[PDB]
């Protein structure tokens, strides 16, 4: 029920152990004076050193003037911190405003277009977004509520994403969750023990290019359905091939254990594993970081589901977009479609209490 | 607890106490066969049975022949019972089916329309329903899938509503959850505790009409969107007023502690507790057992949100429509529109190992 610290060298949210709940907002800024959008990100700061407590926004939730609205809108109130993490970046289209074109970094790409997209332009992209991650829907729903409600005038929400369970690991020593496809997601990441593997594959370096961005990282965002009418009429053997790994246990081919190392050769060579693997991508390797999502039905009888899928790399060019071009021929295609993108340059951390969300941009 | 017993003389989920989360399906009925519809009812019961102890369905998630699909998707391994109940109803609709029209309950009543309703019908009405509840999401998420795939070819799913948070209590002891307007929601509710005021008003009886309904309840589900960014400028005052209680502790208008019983007169004469109250509604009174919810966002910039709201009673015309139409000055309306509604006949409970869901109704 306990508290992840907010300040840092780096933003937490990222190597920070994966929450069971994610509430992600992408928002656009409305706001063309740079010296207000300043202030809103330090009365954003403010919030989420409360909220990543447990705290009430402002002058909180009750017992101010009766004639006041309440700091906070109070739908936390009774709650515990619950591992919150709120984790701010920064698309490339905000690097329009503000004067700020010069400092968009180069390792903040544009992905490409890829085989089989079919993006909805509505739930893609964003000048900005905010991950919050908690082990109560409430809190991190409370949380995104109330930086929304704070940076009206200024900012507003361009699309949002529930996910109602976690996808993913950072903490090997624990269980292994499972996407809808009922496969253990996870298993081959990065810890967030493992500082080398962060340095080397997460956190952008000064010597990189882009002093301001130096201990933050980049995040591409997937909103990825599942065919899941398809896929329930699969069999066992067909699902366990697409992966490369068995279903029960998530032991790579032929072997009895999830952890085992893969034996590549071993996997069909459309599978996802194999494709995916960092010795398939010249050793490029990922930190992935998302969640399943359900938004109703399809209106024609059938669950809609999916993952929202992120990834934290320290360049897109040398992270998300080779691998994701390895996957054009993975026997998983058949199931999914990637139906909402986005990125962003996750700035470094709040270094202390004085400190403020992009403090090294602006 | 870990686990919630399911079989029992009433279905659990209804007085037992209300888990975390919420994943509530609405099904239409596609066969017109009624052997068919009867042994889909009895492979969801032994299904139901599985999945609240935690277990896969039929013969499990993995470990089959290869060359056929699992009988369970897989997404619930790892987990735990985690409370999970499976509430079945019956909709009005349904009866048109199977040669069962005359059996259609009285109290199973048609809602009126009502002032201010905005009702999408796709996210409306519905055959069938299934409650799924249960502390930890996916556990209540693989549920409703694995019934969904379990039934697909008999019927389909029509609407779906997760619910994230509870805003509802049958456990007076435990802390009230607060709704996404920033209350306390549940405080003068019916307690799982309550036998008495369970069999006066949320049981159905065998003398009320409608004999295989007896031990069963009555189901109102309304998808009440809420007016965040308008709330959330209201001042501090406003809110209270609003409700006829003060938002941190929760006490009635001049009382000091949550639970403390109300004094009406001292409310305004539109706050939603003085409309609400069974003395302003001839003794009405419900079992409230709604969650919050949010889709997304709405078209234009502000986050999508609300409350799925449940009521039980022993008889629609005596319990939610009288209460509900009491709301139709409600300071709360400015807030809130009702934009989803569905009833339901929920049947008795599946007394044993051999009963089946809707085996009262079927024979
Ligand atoms: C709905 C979509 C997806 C599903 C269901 C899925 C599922 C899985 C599963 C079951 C595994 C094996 C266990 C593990 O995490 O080690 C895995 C591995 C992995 N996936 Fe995915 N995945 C999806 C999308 C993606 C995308 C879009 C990428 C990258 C562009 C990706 C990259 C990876 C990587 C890098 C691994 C680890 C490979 C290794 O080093 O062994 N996945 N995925
Ligand atoms: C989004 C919509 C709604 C919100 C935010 C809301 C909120 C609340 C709040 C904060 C309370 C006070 C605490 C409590 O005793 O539970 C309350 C009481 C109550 N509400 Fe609502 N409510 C909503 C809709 C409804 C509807 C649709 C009905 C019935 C048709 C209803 C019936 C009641 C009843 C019976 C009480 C208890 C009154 C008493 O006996 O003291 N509510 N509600």
Redesign the pocket.
């Known amino acids: 029920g306990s508290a992840v610290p907010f300040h840092g060298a780096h933003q937490a949210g990222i190597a920070t152990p994966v929450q069971d709940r994610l509430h992600f907002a992408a928002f656009d800024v409305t706001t063309e004076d740079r010296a207000a959008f300043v202030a809103l990100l330090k009365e954003w700061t403010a919030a989420a050193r409360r909220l990543t407590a447990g705290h009430a926004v402002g002058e909180g939730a009750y017992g101010g003037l009766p004639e006041a609205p309440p700091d906070d809108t109070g739908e936390a109130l009774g709650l515990k911190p619950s591992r919150l993490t709120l984790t701010i970046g920064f698309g490339p289209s905000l690097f329009t405003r503000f004067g700020l074109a010069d400092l968009r970094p180069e390792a903040l790409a544009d992905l490409p277009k890829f085989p089989g997209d079919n993006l909805d332009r509505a739930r893609s992209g964003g000048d900005l977004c905010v991950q919050a991650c908690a082990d109560d829907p409430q809190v991190a729903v409370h949380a995104i509520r109330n930086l929304a409600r704070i940076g009206f005038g200024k900012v507003v929400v361009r699309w949002s994403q529930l996910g109602f369970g976690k996808?993913?690991?950072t903490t090997p020593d624990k269980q292994?969750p499972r996407?809808?496809?009922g496969?253990?997601?996870?298993?081959?990441?990065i810890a967030g023990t493992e500082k080398d593997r962060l340095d080397r594959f997460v956190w952008a370096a000064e010597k990189d290019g882009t002093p301001w961005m130096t201990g933050g990282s980049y995040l591409?965002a997937?909103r990825?359905?599942?065919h899941i009418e398809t896929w329930d009429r699969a069999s066992l053997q067909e699902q366990e091939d697409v992966?490369?790994?068995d279903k029960g246990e998530?032991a790579?081919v032929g072997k009895a254990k999830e952890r085992d190392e893969?034996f590549?050769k071993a996997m069909k060579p459309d599978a996802?594993?194999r494709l995916?693997?960092?010795?398939s991508?010249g050793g490029?390797?990922?930190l992935?970081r998302?969640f399943s999502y359900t938004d109703g039905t399809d209106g024609l009888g059938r669950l809609d589901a999916?993952?929202f899928?992120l990834?934290y790399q320290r360049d897109i060019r040398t992270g998300?977009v080779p691998?994701?071009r390895?996957?054009a021929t993975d026997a998983?295609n058949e199931?999914?479609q990637?139906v909402g993108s986005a990125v962003f340059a996750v700035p470094p951390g709040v270094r202390d209490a004085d400190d403020w969300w992009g403090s090294t941009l602006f």
């Open positions: 996808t993913s690991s292994t996407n809808l496809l496969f253990k997601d996870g298993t081959r990441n591409v997937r990825i359905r599942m992966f490369g790994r998530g790579p893969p590549l996802h594993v995916a693997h960092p010795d991508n490029a390797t990922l992935r998302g999916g993952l899928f990834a998300f691998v994701q390895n996957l998983l199931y999914i990637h």
